Amino acid sequence: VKELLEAGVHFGHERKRWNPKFARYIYAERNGIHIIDLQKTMEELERTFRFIEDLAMRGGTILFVGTKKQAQDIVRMEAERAGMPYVNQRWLGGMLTNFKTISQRVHRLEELEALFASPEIEERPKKEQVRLKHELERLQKYLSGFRLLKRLPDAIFVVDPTKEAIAVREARKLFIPVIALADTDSDPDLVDYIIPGNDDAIRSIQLILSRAVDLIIQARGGVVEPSPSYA
Amino acid sequence: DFEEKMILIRRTARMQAGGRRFRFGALVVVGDRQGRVGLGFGKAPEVPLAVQKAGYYARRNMVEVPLQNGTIPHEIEVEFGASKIVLKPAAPGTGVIAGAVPRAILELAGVTDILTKELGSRNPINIAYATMEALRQLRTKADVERLR
Amino acid sequence: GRYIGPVCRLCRREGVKLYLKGERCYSPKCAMERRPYPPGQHGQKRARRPSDYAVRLREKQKLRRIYGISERQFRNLFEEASKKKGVTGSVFLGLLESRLDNVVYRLGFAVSRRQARQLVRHGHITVNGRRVDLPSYRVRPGDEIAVAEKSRNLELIRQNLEAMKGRKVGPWLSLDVEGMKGKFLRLPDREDLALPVNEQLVIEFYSR
Amino acid sequence: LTDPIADMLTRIRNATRVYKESTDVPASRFKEEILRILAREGFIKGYERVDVDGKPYLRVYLKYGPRRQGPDPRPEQVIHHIRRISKPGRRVYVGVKEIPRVRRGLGIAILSTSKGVLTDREARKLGVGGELICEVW
RNA sequence: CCUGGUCCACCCGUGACGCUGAGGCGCGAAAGCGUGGGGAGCAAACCGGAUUAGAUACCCGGGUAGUCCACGCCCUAAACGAUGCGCGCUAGGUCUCUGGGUCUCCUGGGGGCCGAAGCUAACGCGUUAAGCGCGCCGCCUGGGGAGUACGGCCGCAAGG
RNA sequence: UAGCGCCGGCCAACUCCGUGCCAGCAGCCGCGGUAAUACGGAGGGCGCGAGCGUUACCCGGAUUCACUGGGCGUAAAGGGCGUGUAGGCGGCCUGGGGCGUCCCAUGUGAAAGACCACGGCUCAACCGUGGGGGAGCGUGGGAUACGCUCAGGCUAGACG
Ligand code: SF4
Ligand SMILES: [Mg+2]
Ligand SMILES: [Mg+2]
Ligand SMILES: [Mg+2]
Ligand SMILES: [Mg+2]
Ligand SMILES: [Mg+2]
Ligand SMILES: [Mg+2]
Ligand SMILES: [Mg+2]
Ligand SMILES: [Mg+2]
Ligand SMILES: [Mg+2]
Ligand SMILES: [Mg+2]
Ligand SMILES: [Mg+2]
Ligand SMILES: [Mg+2]
Ligand SMILES: [Mg+2]
Ligand SMILES: [Mg+2]
Ligand SMILES: [Mg+2]
Ligand SMILES: [Mg+2]
Ligand SMILES: [Mg+2]
Ligand SMILES: [Mg+2]
Ligand SMILES: [Mg+2]
Ligand SMILES: [Mg+2]
Ligand SMILES: [Mg+2]
Ligand SMILES: [Mg+2]
Ligand SMILES: [Mg+2]
Ligand SMILES: [Mg+2]
Ligand SMILES: [Mg+2]
Ligand SMILES: [Mg+2]
Ligand SMILES: [Mg+2]
Ligand SMILES: [Mg+2]
Ligand SMILES: [Mg+2]
Ligand SMILES: [Mg+2]
Ligand SMILES: [Mg+2]
Ligand SMILES: [Mg+2]
Ligand SMILES: [Mg+2]
Ligand SMILES: [Mg+2]
Ligand SMILES: [Mg+2]
Ligand SMILES: [Mg+2]
Ligand SMILES: [Mg+2]
Ligand SMILES: [Mg+2]
Ligand SMILES: [Mg+2]
Ligand SMILES: [Mg+2]
Ligand SMILES: [Mg+2]
Ligand SMILES: [Mg+2]
Ligand SMILES: [Mg+2]
Numbered sequence A: 001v002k003e004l005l006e007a008g009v010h011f012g013h014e015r016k017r018w019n020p021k022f023a024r025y026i027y028a029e030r031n032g033i034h035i036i037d038l039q040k041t042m043e044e045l046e047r048t049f050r051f052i053e054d055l056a057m058r059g060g061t062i063l064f065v066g067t068k069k070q071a072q073d074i075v076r077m078e079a080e081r082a083g084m085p086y087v088n089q090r091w092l093g094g095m096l097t098n099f100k101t102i103s104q105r106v107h108r109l110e111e112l113e114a115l116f117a118s119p120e121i122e123e124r125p126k127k128e129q130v131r132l133k134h135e136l137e138r139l140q141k142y143l144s145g146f147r148l149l150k151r152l153p154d155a156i157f158v159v160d161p162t163k164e165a166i167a168v169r170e171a172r173k174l175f176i177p178v179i180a181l182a183d184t185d186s187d188p189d190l191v192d193y194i195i196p197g198n199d200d201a202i203r204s205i206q207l208i209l210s211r212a213v214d215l216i217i218q219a220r221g222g223v224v225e226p227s228p229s230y231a
Numbered sequence B: 001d002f003e004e005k006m007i008l009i010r011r012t013a014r015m016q017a018g019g020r021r022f023r024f025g026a027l028v029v030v031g032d033r034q035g036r037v038g039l040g041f042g043k044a045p046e047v048p049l050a051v052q053k054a055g056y057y058a059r060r061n062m063v064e065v066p067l068q069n070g071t072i073p074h075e076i077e078v079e080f081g082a083s084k085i086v087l088k089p090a091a092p093g094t095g096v097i098a099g100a101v102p103r104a105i106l107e108l109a110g111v112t113d114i115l116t117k118e119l120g121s122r123n124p125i126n127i128a129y130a131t132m133e134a135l136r137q138l139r140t141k142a143d144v145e146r147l148r
Numbered sequence C: 001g002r003y004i005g006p007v008c009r010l011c012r013r014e015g016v017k018l019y020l021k022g023e024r025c026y027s028p029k030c031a032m033e034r035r036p037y038p039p040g041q042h043g044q045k046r047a048r049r050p051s052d053y054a055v056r057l058r059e060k061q062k063l064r065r066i067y068g069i070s071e072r073q074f075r076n077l078f079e080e081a082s083k084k085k086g087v088t089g090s091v092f093l094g095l096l097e098s099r100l101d102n103v104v105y106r107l108g109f110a111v112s113r114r115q116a117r118q119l120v121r122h123g124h125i126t127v128n129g130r131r132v133d134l135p136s137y138r139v140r141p142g143d144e145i146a147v148a149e150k151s152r153n154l155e156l157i158r159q160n161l162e163a164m165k166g167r168k169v170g171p172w173l174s175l176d177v178e179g180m181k182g183k184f185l186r187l188p189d190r191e192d193l194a195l196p197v198n199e200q201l202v203i204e205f206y207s208r
Numbered sequence D: 001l002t003d004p005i006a007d008m009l010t011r012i013r014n015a016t017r018v019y020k021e022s023t024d025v026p027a028s029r030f031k032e033e034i035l036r037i038l039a040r041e042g043f044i045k046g047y048e049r050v051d052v053d054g055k056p057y058l059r060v061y062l063k064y065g066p067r068r069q070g071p072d073p074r075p076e077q078v079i080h081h082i083r084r085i086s087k088p089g090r091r092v093y094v095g096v097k098e099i100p101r102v103r104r105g106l107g108i109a110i111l112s113t114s115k116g117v118l119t120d121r122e123a124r125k126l127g128v129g130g131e132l133i134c135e136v137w
Numbered sequence E: 001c002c003u004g005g006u007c008c009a010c011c012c013g014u015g016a017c018g019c020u021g022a023g024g025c026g027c028g029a030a031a032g033c034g035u036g037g038g039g040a041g042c043a044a045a046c047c048g049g050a051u052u053a054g055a056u057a058c059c060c061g062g063g064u065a066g067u068c069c070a071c072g073c074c075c076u077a078a079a080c081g082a083u084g085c086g087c088g089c090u091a092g093g094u095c096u097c098u099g100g101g102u103c104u105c106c107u108g109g110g111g112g113c114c115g116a117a118g119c120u121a122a123c124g125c126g127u128u129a130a131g132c133g134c135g136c137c138g139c140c141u142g143g144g145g146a147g148u149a150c151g152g153c154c155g156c157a158a159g160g
Numbered sequence F: 001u002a003g004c005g006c007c008g009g010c011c012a013a014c015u016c017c018g019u020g021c022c023a024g025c026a027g028c029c030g031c032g033g034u035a036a037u038a039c040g041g042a043g044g045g046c047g048c049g050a051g052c053g054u055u056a057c058c059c060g061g062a063u064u065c066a067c068u069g070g071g072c073g074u075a076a077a078g079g080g081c082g083u084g085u086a087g088g089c090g091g092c093c094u095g096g097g098g099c100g101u102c103c104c105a106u107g108u109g110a111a112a113g114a115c116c117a118c119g120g121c122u123c124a125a126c127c128g129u130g131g132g133g134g135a136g137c138g139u140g141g142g143a144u145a146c147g148c149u150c151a152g153g154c155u156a157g158a159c160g
């Protein structure tokens, strides 16, 4: 499952826009660029996946965090493939720390599902349709992956702990383990299970996500061959 | 469940056109008198809700005090901004010698025997915070040998 | 001197029955049993929560008004136990107990401590022989406290020993009824005596 | 520089507050005696005489606790506290009888005595006093 | 022309010769003073015109000390970074000035900004600490009375 | 024989009338301008008790002179800046001494008082008997890590 042709996909980026805590996972600066010791990536995959694999067979949910436009679509395929929740658009404040309240806003979604599946009155004003439809069209935009989540995840898995510091912040306050693919602009000490790698190139996001999705499905009852990606 | 005590209840005001409009706050400790306390601070439009709101936080932030025959294991001095609290271990028949603030905090924590002293700003809310963070920094011989 | 006044107003304030008479304390003509609320114009109003200081004074007068004791003697007896070795609380109770005027009453020589005083002050009591008319004597282990022979034929002490025929008396005391003599075995552990009082709080009253 | 010991204790205290693996102090037979106790009593892993750019130093291997769950992952310290007592400004000595008990036993006090560098315990066993160098917990 | 501090590179010389600093001594913006010059512009005082209830001001026209030079006094300040000096330790990004290199950049020394840890009552400080430490000095102890009075020393006086 | 202080918050104890910024209360914040638990009386209540209150003074609360145990950017607080006298303070290695420092043995540290036990006055106050010490200084012996001194080296501080 592990693989070594990762250097055929990322080895890292971003110059002196670095975070000094990450130096322990950096090989050298060549291309005017911080370069990640890929060896140092394997070590942490071994330990991180052990967590994920051990987390797999226990039948426990995982929240998928990626919202930079470089990792936007690629998380949506993969979280569904493993049948687990994600956030694609905005990470709402209090998704975790205020779950019962945020998820009180999925009950409005599930309730819209039914109402627009006929009939429960269509003699409701034309303009109210206009209003309700768009609201469904609005709600749908954000919550499509969060709706699966019906309880606090036993872990969360992140693309950018720097870009999604808020997510990381809530998880911490809820003692939830934090997992993340994360490059040198990020804060290492902040993540429990670290995948020290490029977090912007779609290449790198595909390799590390999918193979982690596969490790999840492998120990969660079955296996399957390849998954969708743009070249 | 725990034994619960309201230590502080205050009214504060804010200003806008037409005059002042108030808001209330309650410092509340809660504990089992057997090694577990928690301090919560609740603010609300009316006294009762604030007292209840407070209680929920009190349970939301707790701490485990290593009682040894009803006294704390070692000296602790702790500062919280300009507030300082001294907690000093005390022998059996001593009693709990503290101001009504750290008194109720330590009391609900099962502390039966202790010498204490408040130094610096004795502001009720801050002396509270300093008493807690003192407990949260209490250690025992076990805890020490395990670290080192 | 001592308190020497209306005594039911005392229990009514304390919220608890203190056994300050004897006979009437048990009948339903007892004041607490008719009115369990503080004496005077404002007793039936709904109370307001007492402050820490309010609470402690009240626990103190409780233990104190039991004994019919002056604050000075109380304070000094207390400030003894504060100095002397061990746990303060027990020793204070202990030294409180070793009072003759108390000892006489715990034995059932008298129906009240107030009567146990008039028994002591009128010489009707004796300690290991010698006449003693001092309510304040600190009775020590091994002491035998008895009635004077020259008064032993008195209605009150005979009638009051009548109840005592097989009556229980605390573990540290023995009693030869008819013979009119009792014995002090030792000063109490807090267990032996169940005064309706949280004794730690009295220390804290004085820590102020 | 006016105080080697105070510099030494301090070089550490800064290093432990941001969890460095080690840090180096300029070498002295007296610092070796203090690090020795600091080694044995287990506030540090241990130390070794290295050399920096031609100059003698002591490299001291720091020791900490475990990662913590929560908003602040930063592991507990092993040296919570370290500070000079006796200083060049105000020399501090204690007779045997007034030797202090640091933190109700859970800590130590290092000494300079005519029998060598000893702890509060040791000094009381050997029966000697000395200049109270510092305190640690 | 005469002269001071200061950085850099070489790692050549001395071998703890160091740090601080009560008194002392010197330096010390402006205004001010003494004797003598100088005086274009500017301008306290002062005159006049406006404004105004008034206008001993703000605005306009004039104008003397002074502002400049030499020598000698005065020694004060929001004399400020409202931050005594020295040393060691504790992430980094960036802009700039100035040496040196193996001239991407590396290394020293100064000048700014943002920020790690930490500090802070907060504001903010943060390798130019207001952080963690040592040494020595100066200073604070409720507002006013009062930087006044008295004494004392200094000054031509102002006054310090 | 039972008296005296208090009942707005601190701080334990509340009602009616009388007064109307008057009369008066007051340790501090504050009370009194027609529904005053704050003034005067009464009832009731709280606290002590042959006592209770008041004035004055001493320590405490005051880590508010800070040795324990504080501070100086904006709260009170860095000297306007240098230079330097006394003084305080000082790097790495080795030896002599043993001044500071630590230990041991001894002398002194009177009696009363303090404390612990016991005992005598019916208890207690009071008093008796015994017990346990300490610093600090004199003397003898010992210790040598740190600070001291003397001596001999070093080059990381400092100067050239
Ligand atoms: S009767 Fe009830 S109230 Fe009156 S004294 Fe006896 S016990 Fe106390
Ligand atoms: Mg990135
Ligand atoms: Mg614990
Ligand atoms: Mg502070
Ligand atoms: Mg405070
Ligand atoms: Mg103990
Ligand atoms: Mg204060
Ligand atoms: Mg206060
Ligand atoms: Mg009873
Ligand atoms: Mg209580
Ligand atoms: Mg005791
Ligand atoms: Mg009883
Ligand atoms: Mg007291
Ligand atoms: Mg000290
Ligand atoms: Mg050389
Ligand atoms: Mg000078
Ligand atoms: Mg001048
Ligand atoms: Mg001039
Ligand atoms: Mg003039
Ligand atoms: Mg002139
Ligand atoms: Mg002229
Ligand atoms: Mg004019
Ligand atoms: Mg005019
Ligand atoms: Mg004019
Ligand atoms: Mg003009
Ligand atoms: Mg002139
Ligand atoms: Mg002039
Ligand atoms: Mg300036
Ligand atoms: Mg400057
Ligand atoms: Mg100034
Ligand atoms: Mg100022
Ligand atoms: Mg200075
Ligand atoms: Mg300073
Ligand atoms: Mg350059
Ligand atoms: Mg160049
Ligand atoms: Mg620079
Ligand atoms: Mg400039
Ligand atoms: Mg800044
Ligand atoms: Mg921070
Ligand atoms: Mg910088
Ligand atoms: Mg400050
Ligand atoms: Mg005054
Ligand atoms: Mg004044
Ligand atoms: Mg003057």
Ligand SMILES: [Mg+2]
Binding pocket: none
């Ligand atoms: Mg002046």
Ligand SMILES: [Mg+2]
Binding pocket: none
């Ligand atoms: Mg004068």
Ligand SMILES: [Mg+2]
Binding pocket: F005, F006
């Ligand atoms: Mg009184």
Ligand SMILES: [Mg+2]
Binding pocket: F011
């Ligand atoms: Mg009182």
Ligand SMILES: [Mg+2]
Binding pocket: none
């Ligand atoms: Mg009250």
Ligand SMILES: [Mg+2]
Binding pocket: F022, F023
């Ligand atoms: Mg009148």
Ligand SMILES: [Mg+2]
Binding pocket: F035
């Ligand atoms: Mg009225």
Ligand SMILES: [Mg+2]
Binding pocket: F038
């Ligand atoms: Mg009053």
Ligand SMILES: [Mg+2]
Binding pocket: none
């Ligand atoms: Mg009244």
Ligand SMILES: [Mg+2]
Binding pocket: none
């Ligand atoms: Mg009397």
Ligand SMILES: [Mg+2]
Binding pocket: none
């Ligand atoms: Mg008197």
Ligand SMILES: [Mg+2]
Binding pocket: none
């Ligand atoms: Mg005083």
Ligand SMILES: [Mg+2]
Binding pocket: none
């Ligand atoms: Mg004091």
Ligand SMILES: [Mg+2]
Binding pocket: F066
């Ligand atoms: Mg001090």
Ligand SMILES: [Mg+2]
Binding pocket: F070, F071
């Ligand atoms: Mg202060």
Ligand SMILES: [Mg+2]
Binding pocket: none
């Ligand atoms: Mg200055």
